[PDB]
Amino acid sequence: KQQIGVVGMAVMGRNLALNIESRGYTVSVFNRSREKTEEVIAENPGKKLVPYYTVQEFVESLETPRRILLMVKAGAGTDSAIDSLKPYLDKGDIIIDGGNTFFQDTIRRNRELSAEGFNFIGTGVSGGEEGTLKGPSIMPGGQKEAYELVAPILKQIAAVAEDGEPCVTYIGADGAGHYVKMVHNGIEYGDMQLIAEAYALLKGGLALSNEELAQTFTEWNEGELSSYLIDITKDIFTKKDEEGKYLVDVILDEAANKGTGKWTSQSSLDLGEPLSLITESVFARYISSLKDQRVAASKVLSGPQAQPAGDKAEFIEKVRRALYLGKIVSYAQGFSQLRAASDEYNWDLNYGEIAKIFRAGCIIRAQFLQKITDAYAQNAGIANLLLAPYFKQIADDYQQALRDVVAYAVQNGIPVPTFSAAIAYYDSYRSAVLPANLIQAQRDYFGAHTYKRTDKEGIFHTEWLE
Amino acid sequence: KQQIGVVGMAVMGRNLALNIESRGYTVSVFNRSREKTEEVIAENPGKKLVPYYTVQEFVESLETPRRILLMVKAGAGTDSAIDSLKPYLDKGDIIIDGGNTFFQDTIRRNRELSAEGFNFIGTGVSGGEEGTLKGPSIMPGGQKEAYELVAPILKQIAAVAEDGEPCVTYIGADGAGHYVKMVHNGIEYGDMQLIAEAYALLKGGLALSNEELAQTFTEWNEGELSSYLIDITKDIFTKKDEEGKYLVDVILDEAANKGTGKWTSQSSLDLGEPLSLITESVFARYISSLKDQRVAASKVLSGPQAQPAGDKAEFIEKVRRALYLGKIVSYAQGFSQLRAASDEYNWDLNYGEIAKIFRAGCIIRAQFLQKITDAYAQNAGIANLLLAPYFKQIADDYQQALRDVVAYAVQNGIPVPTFSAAIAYYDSYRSAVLPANLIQAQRDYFGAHTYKRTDKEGIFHTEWLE
């Protein structure tokens, strides 16, 4: 019998099944309809993929306890796939949902399937089509015993960091994996928006051509900013269409989204976390969708004439620094939310291990994730990444560049929502005292909400008039 | 019989009942327990308040169709109050929930009570304890026919604008009123945070004493910033405790919240609205709660030495301008969300009328709300308040001040999350082209998400490598 089965032969499931096959495992494959399953085998002769055309047969062909990988698109189809499998499962079998599922849904299915005798692993899978085929970052949450059973296969198919550690680990119970996958995506939204601002600043302040953009990103990619996102960005700036037009310059600036970005921010608001940078990233996507409103407004609203930033190399460097410190702030906010979530949902998350599996496979992969790993390696209970020696030092050295870039952008009409968010956060966090004293005073005045005092114990209320 | 009854004799309900009484109406009062009801009458001899100590009697003493005002604290008690009333109601009776209820709960009760033959009006009430007693802004949503029946009383007790129009109006169906009340609160969070930044900037850049702060706010209050929030703020800066200490300087800077701020932002994220300013206001409150983390971080993280802002009067004026334009941006974002919500929930909101009832009674009351009223008076379908002639002109004239203040703040270590949000929004909105073209290009690259072109119809996907 096969050790594992994959349900859902669309690209992602097909690729994952091929990945499993490449590691020397024989895998059973199944798809709601039979055409995709037939195409997979047609296109992959000689591979150890065994097709089934009925749920029952697919389930029977797996060694127990069964390990069933659902790669169908997250949503109702996940439930129908589960419902179609149930009647044929033995107590102890394991269903693993690799869809981009909202964590509360995974928590619900996990609790419900558990009550019926089945294990449920909600797992994030990150890497794009090519990543799923070659080695994605895998983020499983669910029963530990079910994880350990399937872990050997997950480890073989995941991307491997350069220290030899596979990019999968036991994240936690029930919905922890899908919650971490959501946060990865929120963090990804933040990195793309920071990069988009770097681009606007170079193009706006120095009028760099696309070839100079490509060259600049290429250089940044050789240093500490080294990352997958930076790499594809330099590629993007060198792409020309069939008639020699730079593709990036004619792509409609309407950034689409698929919830996860929204989801992370909504969670930050439920958990009391100041996740301003990723949240501003989501809002920047929302405003780019108001394209018609923006063109209209551009003919009506006035603004300053953007003046050249000055020496090219120096400005480019300040923008590089700003970007890197911007990422530091965004991730400090992201990992602080992972802690808030861990507490709320009782997951005992291991932040260092999560950072470790983000080092390769996933879309946000970068040498930067090793810096985060090191930070937790030296102090697991660190309150905020900004306090880590490495990050503290980068802030010491790069904040002036961030401050200069934001002032330039604001004085020149270039919107820098996340760079502005990053400096506002850095300055708020290091403030022993914020103006919330006035906010509290106003609340007690118009709403008798009471306040506390810095010089005296007790809870007070004041008759502000007399 | 009495024309109306009030349930819930805590302060807010007591005051509302007294308000109704002051207008010449006799009102029946009731409270779950009898002590508060006994105290109300004890303390208010000669007033036309008729106490009842059983639900049944309270319901019987009202002329039909009955108008029952629930002033109990929003939550489970609202449901228990409703459940206790039901058995004694006649089809057509009207229950009005004046609690600070989340709009989806009002939609649920409205639908459910409707199916049983009863009308349900979820209504925001804003004014604080003193406002509920003297004249609050009232924002009712529910069956129109039920609204018209009770409207005469609501109009008599609401605050009245100087043009003689009472600050209550039919907002819309089901949960529209409570949704508008939520947005008022989100907008209030934004105004308090903008004011808190003005304060940080004056105190940080010019080291103004509290007496100078008071004097400055007093002057601002005499001009276009004229508002309730600005007024109590100047009061706050002159308040001294029993031993001569300025109260504002010893109040613990940990801004509490009660959801509505959070709620507005969560809705903006569900509706695709870039409500960055109020959202940053909520996050600023979240970070002020991390007081211990902030004190710790203040001894560890470095930052620049804040240098004096320069001439006092000139800087003060730039900060006044910045604040006013900041409010313009926040409200543009708020009213755009009111439209997004109106569309989503099928309310056909009348923005001008909502602005009109915010002119007095409510916490955000200000001459500014008349500017918004005028804007809708001249163009009901205006896409964004920034496009309104009055606001367009203020932006033309005050943006440079906003830009100078933010650059100064950022170069000097003073966190200005909302002022930064305001300029980032103004600059994004007027941008015919944003860097989301790159974001779209990256998405198609790693996720094959496809993109559109500015120079060609169709939806494309590109093999970015080759």
Side-chain angles (χ1 to χ4, degrees), chain A residues 233 235 241 248 250 252-253 256 266 269-270 280 286 291 293-294 298 302 396 403-404 410-411 426 429 431-432 434 437 440 442 445 452-454, chain B residues 233 235 241 248 250 252-253 256 266 269-270 280 286 291 293-294 298 302 396 403-404 410-411 426 429-432 434 437 440 442 445 452-454:
Chain A
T233 298
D235 283 339
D241 76 350
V248 70
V250 291
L252 177 61
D253 51 308
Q266 266 173 161
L269 285 161
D270 285 327
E280 292 295 339
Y286 292 175
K291 175 63 169 190
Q293 273 186 72
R294 291 188 285 107
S298 69
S302 66
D396 280 356
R403 298 181 193 284
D404 291 355
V410 163
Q411 278 296 320
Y426 181 80
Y429 194 70
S431 286
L434 282 164
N437 54 315
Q440 279 297 103
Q442 291 157 336
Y445 184 130
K452 284 173 192 158
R453 285 177 62 152
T454 184
Chain B
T233 298
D235 283 339
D241 76 350
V248 70
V250 291
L252 177 61
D253 51 308
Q266 266 173 161
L269 285 161
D270 285 327
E280 292 295 339
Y286 292 175
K291 175 63 169 190
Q293 273 186 72
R294 291 188 285 107
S298 69
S302 66
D396 280 356
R403 298 181 193 284
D404 291 355
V410 163
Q411 278 296 320
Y426 181 80
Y429 194 70
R430 80 201 175 70
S431 286
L434 282 164
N437 54 315
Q440 279 297 103
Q442 291 157 336
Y445 184 130
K452 284 173 192 158
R453 285 177 62 152
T454 184

Coordinates of all heavy atoms in Angstrom, one line a residue, chain A residues 233 235 241 248 250 252-253 256 266 269-270 280 286 291 293-294 298 302 396 403-404 410-411 426 429 431-432 434 437 440 442 445 452-454, chain B residues 233 235 241 248 250 252-253 256 266 269-270 280 286 291 293-294 298 302 396 403-404 410-411 426 429-432 434 437 440 442 445 452-454:
Chain A
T233 N 12.2 40.9 -7.9 CA 12.0 42.3 -8.2 C 13.1 42.8 -9.2 O 12.8 43.5 -10.1 CB 12.1 43.1 -6.9 OG1 11.0 42.7 -6.0 CG2 11.9 44.6 -7.2
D235 N 14.5 40.9 -11.3 CA 14.1 40.2 -12.5 C 13.0 41.1 -13.2 O 13.1 41.3 -14.3 CB 13.6 38.8 -12.2 CG 14.7 37.8 -11.9 OD1 15.8 38.1 -12.3 OD2 14.3 36.7 -11.4
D241 N 8.4 43.1 -22.9 CA 7.4 42.3 -23.7 C 7.9 42.2 -25.1 O 8.9 42.7 -25.5 CB 6.0 43.0 -23.6 CG 5.8 44.2 -24.5 OD1 6.8 44.7 -25.1 OD2 4.7 44.7 -24.6
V248 N 6.9 46.1 -16.4 CA 6.4 46.7 -15.2 C 5.8 48.1 -15.3 O 4.9 48.5 -14.6 CB 7.6 46.8 -14.1 CG1 8.7 47.8 -14.6 CG2 7.0 47.2 -12.8
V250 N 3.7 49.0 -17.7 CA 2.3 49.0 -18.2 C 1.4 48.1 -17.5 O 0.3 47.8 -17.9 CB 2.3 48.7 -19.7 CG1 2.9 49.8 -20.6 CG2 3.0 47.3 -20.0
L252 N -1.3 47.4 -14.7 CA -2.2 48.2 -14.0 C -2.0 48.2 -12.5 O -2.0 47.1 -11.9 CB -3.7 47.8 -14.3 CG -4.8 48.5 -13.5 CD1 -4.9 49.9 -13.9 CD2 -6.2 47.8 -13.9
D253 N -1.8 49.4 -11.9 CA -1.5 49.5 -10.5 C -2.7 49.3 -9.6 O -3.1 50.1 -8.9 CB -0.8 50.9 -10.2 CG -1.6 52.0 -10.8 OD1 -1.9 52.0 -12.0 OD2 -2.0 53.0 -10.0
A256 N -4.3 43.4 -6.1 CA -5.4 42.5 -5.7 C -4.9 41.9 -4.3 O -3.8 42.0 -3.9 CB -5.6 41.4 -6.7
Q266 N -6.9 41.8 11.0 CA -8.0 41.7 11.8 C -7.7 41.1 13.2 O -8.3 41.4 14.2 CB -9.2 41.0 11.1 CG -10.1 42.1 10.3 CD -11.1 41.5 9.4 OE1 -12.1 42.2 9.1 NE2 -10.9 40.3 9.0
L269 N -6.1 43.4 15.6 CA -7.1 44.3 16.3 C -7.8 43.5 17.4 O -8.2 44.1 18.4 CB -8.0 44.8 15.2 CG -7.5 46.0 14.3 CD1 -8.3 46.1 13.0 CD2 -7.5 47.2 15.2
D270 N -8.1 42.2 17.1 CA -8.7 41.4 18.2 C -7.8 41.1 19.4 O -8.2 41.0 20.5 CB -9.2 40.0 17.7 CG -10.4 40.1 16.8 OD1 -11.3 40.9 17.0 OD2 -10.5 39.3 15.9
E280 N -1.0 48.8 7.2 CA -0.9 49.9 6.2 C -0.6 49.2 4.9 O -1.1 49.7 3.9 CB 0.3 50.8 6.6 CG -0.1 51.6 7.9 CD -1.2 52.6 7.7 OE1 -1.5 52.9 6.5 OE2 -1.9 53.0 8.7
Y286 N -5.8 48.5 -0.8 CA -7.2 49.0 -0.9 C -7.2 50.3 -1.7 O -8.1 50.4 -2.6 CB -7.9 49.2 0.4 CG -8.1 47.9 1.3 CD1 -8.6 48.0 2.6 CD2 -7.9 46.7 0.7 CE1 -9.0 46.9 3.3 CE2 -8.2 45.5 1.4 CZ -8.7 45.6 2.7 OH -9.1 44.5 3.4
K291 N -8.4 53.0 -8.3 CA -7.7 53.6 -9.4 C -8.5 54.8 -10.1 O -7.9 55.9 -10.3 CB -7.4 52.5 -10.5 CG -6.8 53.0 -11.8 CD -5.4 53.6 -11.6 CE -4.8 53.8 -13.0 NZ -3.4 54.3 -12.9
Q293 N -10.9 56.6 -8.9 CA -11.0 57.7 -7.9 C -9.6 58.5 -7.9 O -9.6 59.7 -7.9 CB -11.3 57.2 -6.5 CG -12.8 57.0 -6.2 CD -13.0 56.7 -4.7 OE1 -12.9 57.5 -3.8 NE2 -13.4 55.4 -4.4
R294 N -8.5 57.7 -8.0 CA -7.2 58.3 -8.0 C -6.9 59.2 -9.2 O -6.3 60.2 -9.1 CB -6.1 57.3 -7.8 CG -6.1 56.6 -6.4 CD -5.0 55.7 -6.1 NE -5.0 54.4 -6.8 CZ -4.2 54.1 -7.8 NH1 -3.4 55.0 -8.3 NH2 -4.2 52.9 -8.3
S298 N -6.3 63.1 -9.1 CA -5.0 63.7 -9.5 C -5.1 64.9 -10.4 O -4.2 65.7 -10.5 CB -4.2 62.6 -10.4 OG -4.9 62.4 -11.6
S302 N -4.0 69.4 -5.4 CA -2.7 69.9 -5.7 C -1.7 69.3 -4.8 O -2.0 68.7 -3.7 CB -2.6 71.4 -5.4 OG -2.8 71.6 -4.0
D396 N 20.3 51.6 15.7 CA 21.3 52.7 16.0 C 21.8 53.3 14.8 O 21.9 54.5 14.6 CB 22.5 52.1 16.8 CG 22.2 51.8 18.3 OD1 21.1 52.2 18.8 OD2 23.1 51.3 19.0
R403 N 14.7 58.2 8.9 CA 14.2 59.5 9.2 C 14.4 60.4 8.0 O 13.5 61.2 7.6 CB 14.9 60.1 10.4 CG 14.6 59.3 11.7 CD 15.3 60.0 12.9 NE 15.3 59.0 14.0 CZ 14.2 58.8 14.7 NH1 13.1 59.4 14.5 NH2 14.3 57.9 15.7
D404 N 15.6 60.4 7.4 CA 15.9 61.3 6.2 C 14.9 60.9 5.0 O 14.4 61.8 4.3 CB 17.3 61.2 5.7 CG 18.3 61.8 6.6 OD1 17.9 62.4 7.7 OD2 19.5 61.7 6.3
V410 N 7.9 62.9 2.4 CA 6.8 63.8 2.8 C 6.9 65.2 2.3 O 5.9 65.8 1.9 CB 6.7 63.8 4.3 CG1 5.8 65.0 4.7 CG2 6.0 62.5 4.8
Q411 N 8.1 65.8 2.3 CA 8.3 67.1 1.8 C 8.1 67.1 0.2 O 7.8 68.1 -0.4 CB 9.7 67.6 2.1 CG 9.9 68.1 3.4 CD 9.1 69.4 3.7 OE1 8.9 70.2 2.8 NE2 8.5 69.5 4.9
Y426 N 8.9 52.7 15.9 CA 10.2 52.8 16.6 C 10.2 53.9 17.7 O 10.6 53.6 18.8 CB 11.3 52.9 15.6 CG 12.7 53.0 16.3 CD1 13.3 51.8 16.6 CD2 13.3 54.2 16.6 CE1 14.5 51.8 17.3 CE2 14.5 54.2 17.3 CZ 15.1 53.0 17.6 OH 16.3 53.0 18.3
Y429 N 7.5 53.0 20.6 CA 7.9 51.9 21.4 C 9.0 52.3 22.4 O 9.1 51.8 23.6 CB 8.4 50.7 20.6 CG 8.6 49.4 21.3 CD1 7.5 48.7 21.8 CD2 9.9 48.9 21.6 CE1 7.7 47.5 22.5 CE2 10.1 47.7 22.3 CZ 8.9 47.1 22.8 OH 9.1 46.0 23.6
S431 N 9.4 55.2 23.7 CA 8.9 56.4 24.5 C 8.4 55.9 25.9 O 7.4 55.2 26.0 CB 7.7 57.0 23.8 OG 8.1 57.8 22.7
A432 N 9.2 56.3 26.9 CA 8.7 55.9 28.3 C 7.3 56.5 28.5 O 6.4 56.0 29.2 CB 9.7 56.4 29.4
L434 N 4.0 58.5 26.5 CA 3.3 58.9 25.3 C 2.2 59.8 25.6 O 1.9 60.0 26.8 CB 2.8 57.6 24.6 CG 3.8 56.8 23.8 CD1 3.3 55.4 23.5 CD2 4.2 57.5 22.5
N437 N -1.6 60.2 28.0 CA -2.1 60.7 29.3 C -3.2 61.7 29.0 O -4.2 61.7 29.8 CB -0.9 61.5 30.0 CG -0.2 62.5 29.2 OD1 0.0 62.3 28.0 ND2 0.0 63.7 29.7
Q440 N -6.4 59.8 28.2 CA -7.0 59.3 29.4 C -7.8 60.4 30.1 O -9.0 60.2 30.5 CB -6.0 58.6 30.2 CG -5.6 57.3 29.8 CD -6.8 56.4 29.9 OE1 -7.5 56.0 28.9 NE2 -7.1 55.9 31.1
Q442 N -9.0 63.1 28.8 CA -10.3 63.4 28.0 C -11.4 62.4 28.3 O -12.5 62.7 28.4 CB -10.0 63.5 26.5 CG -9.1 64.7 26.0 CD -8.5 64.4 24.7 OE1 -8.3 63.3 24.4 NE2 -8.1 65.5 24.0
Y445 N -13.0 63.0 31.5 CA -13.8 64.2 31.4 C -15.2 64.0 30.8 O -16.2 64.2 31.5 CB -12.9 65.2 30.7 CG -13.6 66.6 30.6 CD1 -12.8 67.7 31.0 CD2 -14.9 66.8 30.1 CE1 -13.3 69.0 30.8 CE2 -15.4 68.1 30.0 CZ -14.6 69.2 30.4 OH -15.0 70.5 30.3
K452 N -5.5 56.3 36.1 CA -4.6 55.9 37.1 C -3.5 57.0 37.1 O -3.4 57.8 36.1 CB -3.9 54.6 36.8 CG -4.8 53.4 37.0 CD -4.1 52.1 36.5 CE -5.1 51.0 36.5 NZ -4.6 49.9 35.6
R453 N -2.8 57.1 38.2 CA -1.7 58.1 38.4 C -0.4 57.4 38.5 O -0.2 56.4 39.0 CB -2.0 59.0 39.6 CG -3.2 60.0 39.4 CD -3.5 60.9 40.6 NE -2.3 61.7 41.0 CZ -2.4 62.8 41.7 NH1 -3.6 63.3 42.0 NH2 -1.3 63.5 42.0
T454 N 0.6 58.2 38.0 CA 2.0 57.8 38.0 C 2.6 58.0 39.3 O 3.6 57.4 39.7 CB 2.7 58.6 37.0 OG1 4.0 58.2 36.9 CG2 2.6 60.1 37.4
Chain B
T233 N -10.0 69.9 26.2 CA -8.6 69.8 26.3 C -7.9 71.1 26.9 O -7.0 70.9 27.6 CB -8.0 69.6 24.8 OG1 -8.5 68.3 24.3 CG2 -6.5 69.4 24.9
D235 N -9.4 72.9 29.0 CA -9.7 72.8 30.4 C -8.7 71.9 31.1 O -8.2 72.2 32.1 CB -11.1 72.2 30.6 CG -12.3 73.2 30.3 OD1 -12.0 74.4 30.3 OD2 -13.4 72.7 30.0
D241 N -4.4 69.5 40.9 CA -5.0 68.7 42.0 C -4.9 69.4 43.3 O -4.3 70.5 43.3 CB -4.3 67.3 42.1 CG -2.9 67.3 42.7 OD1 -2.4 68.4 43.0 OD2 -2.4 66.2 43.0
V248 N -2.8 66.6 34.3 CA -2.4 65.9 33.1 C -1.0 65.3 33.1 O -0.8 64.2 32.5 CB -2.6 66.8 31.9 CG1 -1.6 67.9 31.9 CG2 -2.6 65.9 30.6
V250 N 0.5 63.8 35.7 CA 0.7 62.6 36.4 C -0.4 61.5 36.1 O -0.5 60.5 36.9 CB 0.6 62.9 38.0 CG1 1.9 63.6 38.3 CG2 -0.7 63.6 38.3
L252 N -1.5 58.3 34.2 CA -0.8 57.2 33.5 C -1.2 57.1 32.1 O -2.4 57.0 31.7 CB -1.1 55.8 34.2 CG -0.5 54.5 33.6 CD1 1.0 54.6 33.6 CD2 -1.0 53.3 34.3
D253 N -0.1 57.2 31.2 CA -0.4 57.1 29.8 C -0.7 55.7 29.2 O 0.0 55.2 28.4 CB 0.9 57.7 29.0 CG 2.2 57.1 29.5 OD1 2.4 57.0 30.7 OD2 3.0 56.6 28.6
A256 N -7.1 53.4 27.5 CA -8.0 52.3 27.5 C -8.9 52.4 26.3 O -8.9 53.5 25.6 CB -8.9 52.3 28.8
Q266 N -12.1 47.2 12.1 CA -12.3 45.8 11.6 C -13.3 45.9 10.4 O -13.2 45.1 9.5 CB -12.8 44.9 12.7 CG -11.6 44.2 13.3 CD -11.9 43.4 14.6 OE1 -11.1 42.5 15.0 NE2 -13.0 43.7 15.2
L269 N -11.6 46.9 7.2 CA -10.8 45.8 6.6 C -11.8 44.9 5.9 O -11.4 44.3 4.9 CB -10.0 45.1 7.7 CG -8.8 45.9 8.2 CD1 -8.3 45.3 9.5 CD2 -7.7 45.6 7.1
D270 N -13.0 44.6 6.4 CA -14.0 43.8 5.8 C -14.5 44.5 4.5 O -14.8 43.8 3.5 CB -15.2 43.5 6.6 CG -14.9 42.5 7.7 OD1 -14.0 41.6 7.5 OD2 -15.5 42.6 8.8
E280 N -4.8 53.8 12.9 CA -3.5 54.1 13.6 C -3.9 54.6 15.0 O -3.2 54.4 16.0 CB -2.8 55.1 12.8 CG -2.2 54.5 11.5 CD -1.2 53.4 11.7 OE1 -0.7 53.4 12.8 OE2 -1.0 52.6 10.8
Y286 N -3.1 50.8 21.6 CA -2.6 49.5 22.0 C -1.2 49.6 22.5 O -0.8 49.0 23.5 CB -2.6 48.5 20.8 CG -4.0 48.1 20.3 CD1 -4.2 47.3 19.2 CD2 -5.1 48.4 21.1 CE1 -5.5 46.8 18.8 CE2 -6.4 48.0 20.7 CZ -6.6 47.2 19.6 OH -7.8 46.7 19.3
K291 N 3.0 49.9 28.4 CA 3.8 50.8 29.2 C 5.1 50.2 29.8 O 6.2 50.8 29.6 CB 2.9 51.4 30.3 CG 3.6 52.3 31.3 CD 4.1 53.5 30.8 CE 4.6 54.5 31.9 NZ 4.9 55.8 31.4
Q293 N 6.7 47.6 28.7 CA 7.6 47.3 27.6 C 8.3 48.7 27.1 O 9.5 48.7 26.8 CB 6.8 46.7 26.4 CG 6.7 45.2 26.4 CD 6.0 44.6 25.1 OE1 6.7 44.6 24.0 NE2 4.8 44.2 25.3
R294 N 7.5 49.8 27.1 CA 8.0 51.1 26.6 C 9.1 51.6 27.6 O 10.1 52.2 27.1 CB 6.9 52.1 26.4 CG 6.0 51.7 25.3 CD 5.0 52.8 25.0 NE 3.8 52.9 25.9 CZ 3.7 53.9 26.8 NH1 4.7 54.8 26.8 NH2 2.6 54.0 27.5
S298 N 12.9 52.2 26.4 CA 13.4 53.5 26.5 C 14.9 53.6 27.1 O 15.6 54.5 26.8 CB 12.6 54.5 27.4 OG 12.6 54.1 28.7
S302 N 18.2 53.6 21.1 CA 18.6 55.0 21.0 C 17.7 55.7 20.0 O 16.9 55.2 19.3 CB 20.0 55.0 20.3 OG 19.9 54.5 19.0
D396 N -4.9 72.7 -0.2 CA -4.0 73.6 -1.0 C -3.2 74.4 -0.1 O -1.9 74.5 -0.1 CB -4.8 74.6 -1.9 CG -5.3 74.0 -3.2 OD1 -5.1 72.8 -3.5 OD2 -6.1 74.7 -3.9
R403 N 3.2 68.8 6.0 CA 4.5 68.2 5.5 C 5.6 68.7 6.4 O 6.5 67.9 6.8 CB 4.8 68.6 4.1 CG 3.8 68.1 3.1 CD 4.1 68.5 1.7 NE 2.9 68.2 0.8 CZ 2.6 67.0 0.4 NH1 3.3 65.9 0.7 NH2 1.5 66.8 -0.4
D404 N 5.7 70.0 6.7 CA 6.8 70.4 7.6 C 6.7 69.8 9.0 O 7.8 69.5 9.6 CB 6.7 72.0 7.8 CG 7.0 72.7 6.6 OD1 7.4 72.2 5.5 OD2 6.9 74.0 6.6
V410 N 9.6 63.5 12.6 CA 10.4 62.3 12.2 C 11.9 62.6 12.4 O 12.6 61.7 12.8 CB 10.1 61.9 10.8 CG1 11.2 61.0 10.3 CG2 8.7 61.1 10.8
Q411 N 12.3 63.8 12.0 CA 13.8 64.1 12.2 C 14.1 64.2 13.7 O 15.2 64.0 14.1 CB 14.1 65.4 11.5 CG 14.3 65.3 10.0 CD 15.5 64.4 9.7 OE1 16.6 64.5 10.3 NE2 15.4 63.6 8.6
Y426 N -3.3 61.5 1.7 CA -3.5 62.6 0.8 C -2.6 62.4 -0.5 O -3.1 62.5 -1.6 CB -3.2 63.9 1.4 CG -3.3 65.1 0.5 CD1 -4.6 65.6 0.3 CD2 -2.3 65.7 -0.2 CE1 -4.8 66.7 -0.6 CE2 -2.4 66.7 -1.1 CZ -3.7 67.2 -1.3 OH -4.0 68.2 -2.2
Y429 N -4.0 59.1 -2.5 CA -5.2 59.4 -3.2 C -5.1 60.2 -4.4 O -5.9 60.0 -5.4 CB -6.2 60.0 -2.2 CG -7.7 60.1 -2.7 CD1 -8.4 58.9 -2.7 CD2 -8.3 61.2 -3.1 CE1 -9.7 58.9 -3.2 CE2 -9.6 61.2 -3.6 CZ -10.3 60.0 -3.6 OH -11.6 60.0 -4.2
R430 N -4.2 61.2 -4.4 CA -4.0 62.1 -5.6 C -3.1 61.5 -6.6 O -2.8 62.1 -7.7 CB -3.6 63.5 -5.1 CG -2.1 63.6 -4.8 CD -1.9 64.9 -4.0 NE -0.5 65.0 -3.5 CZ 0.5 65.3 -4.4 NH1 0.3 65.6 -5.6 NH2 1.7 65.4 -3.9
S431 N -2.5 60.3 -6.4 CA -1.6 59.7 -7.3 C -2.3 58.9 -8.4 O -2.9 57.9 -8.1 CB -0.7 58.6 -6.5 OG 0.2 59.3 -5.7
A432 N -2.2 59.4 -9.6 CA -2.8 58.7 -10.7 C -2.2 57.2 -10.8 O -2.8 56.2 -11.1 CB -2.6 59.4 -12.1
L434 N 0.3 54.4 -8.6 CA 1.0 54.1 -7.4 C 1.9 52.9 -7.7 O 1.8 52.3 -8.8 CB -0.1 53.7 -6.3 CG -0.8 54.8 -5.6 CD1 -2.0 54.4 -4.9 CD2 0.2 55.5 -4.6
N437 N 1.9 48.6 -9.2 CA 2.2 47.9 -10.5 C 3.3 46.9 -10.2 O 3.2 45.7 -10.7 CB 2.7 48.9 -11.6 CG 3.9 49.7 -11.1 OD1 3.9 50.3 -10.0 ND2 4.9 49.9 -12.0
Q440 N 1.7 44.0 -8.3 CA 1.0 43.1 -9.1 C 2.0 42.1 -9.9 O 1.8 40.9 -10.1 CB 0.2 43.9 -10.1 CG -1.1 44.4 -9.4 CD -2.0 43.2 -9.1 OE1 -2.0 42.7 -7.9 NE2 -2.6 42.6 -10.1
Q442 N 5.0 41.2 -9.0 CA 5.5 40.2 -8.1 C 4.5 39.1 -7.9 O 4.9 37.9 -7.8 CB 5.9 40.8 -6.7 CG 7.1 41.7 -6.7 CD 7.1 42.7 -5.6 OE1 6.0 42.9 -5.0 NE2 8.2 43.2 -5.2
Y445 N 4.5 36.8 -10.7 CA 5.7 36.1 -10.8 C 5.7 34.8 -9.8 O 5.8 33.7 -10.3 CB 6.9 37.0 -10.5 CG 8.3 36.4 -10.5 CD1 9.2 37.1 -11.3 CD2 8.6 35.3 -9.8 CE1 10.5 36.6 -11.4 CE2 9.9 34.8 -9.9 CZ 10.9 35.5 -10.7 OH 12.2 35.1 -10.8
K452 N -3.4 43.1 -15.2 CA -4.0 43.8 -16.3 C -3.0 44.8 -16.8 O -2.0 45.1 -16.1 CB -5.3 44.5 -15.8 CG -6.5 43.6 -15.7 CD -7.6 44.3 -15.0 CE -8.7 43.4 -14.6 NZ -9.6 44.1 -13.5
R453 N -3.2 45.3 -18.0 CA -2.3 46.3 -18.6 C -3.0 47.5 -18.9 O -4.2 47.6 -19.2 CB -1.7 45.7 -19.9 CG -0.6 44.7 -19.7 CD 0.0 44.1 -21.0 NE 0.6 45.1 -21.8 CZ 1.6 44.9 -22.6 NH1 2.1 43.7 -22.8 NH2 2.2 45.9 -23.3
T454 N -2.3 48.6 -18.7 CA -2.7 49.9 -19.0 C -2.8 50.3 -20.4 O -3.5 51.2 -20.8 CB -1.7 50.9 -18.3 OG1 -2.2 52.2 -18.5 CG2 -0.4 50.7 -19.0

